[PDB]
């Protein structure tokens, strides 16, 4: 418990603090050259999957083909602790739906869990792979509850937990918003 504890926590201080206030005006500035009548403008929140039992892969056209990456945000910077200029970088998604575009979002997955379930390599991280599994959805309540008591983070992201098409779960949450 207290190892996915911790990580949520470090997640939220050391990176979703220090993003998340600045992803609108990000989005905002990709937009302008970008949106038109002809297209769907980039979603104005943070996209973050939150699978409970993945392998959790670095591209995300490898866990679903109808999931396309179209380009990056500006990226943002800033001095962190002894590294100057520090680099924050996120992607800008298509979700196609029978060969067409049907959404367009900033998306990720929470690189914790990709780390937590890369422990199991090394006999020195302890816990087998059941209690990795219990470490998931403790990460993703702690995360939750963490957000809950934060509504400016809240209203700039989404979390998408689940155990397949993942376009269809990332657009059913995407759906939810507009209408
Ligand atoms: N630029 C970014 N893009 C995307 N996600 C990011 C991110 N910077 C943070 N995060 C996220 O916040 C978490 C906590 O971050 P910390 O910054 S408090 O610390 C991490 C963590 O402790 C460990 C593994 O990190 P890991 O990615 S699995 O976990 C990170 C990550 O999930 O190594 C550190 N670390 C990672 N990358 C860097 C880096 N470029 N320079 C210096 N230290 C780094
Ligand atoms: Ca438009
Ligand atoms: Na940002
Ligand atoms: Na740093
Ligand atoms: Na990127
Ligand atoms: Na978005």
Redesign the pocket.
Known sequence: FNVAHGLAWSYYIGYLRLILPELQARIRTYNQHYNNLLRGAVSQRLYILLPLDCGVPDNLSMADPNIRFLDKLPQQTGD????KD?VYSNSIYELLENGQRAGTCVLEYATPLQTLFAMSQYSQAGFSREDRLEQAKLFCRTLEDILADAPESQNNCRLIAYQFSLSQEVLRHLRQEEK
């Open positions: 962190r602790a002894g590294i520090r």
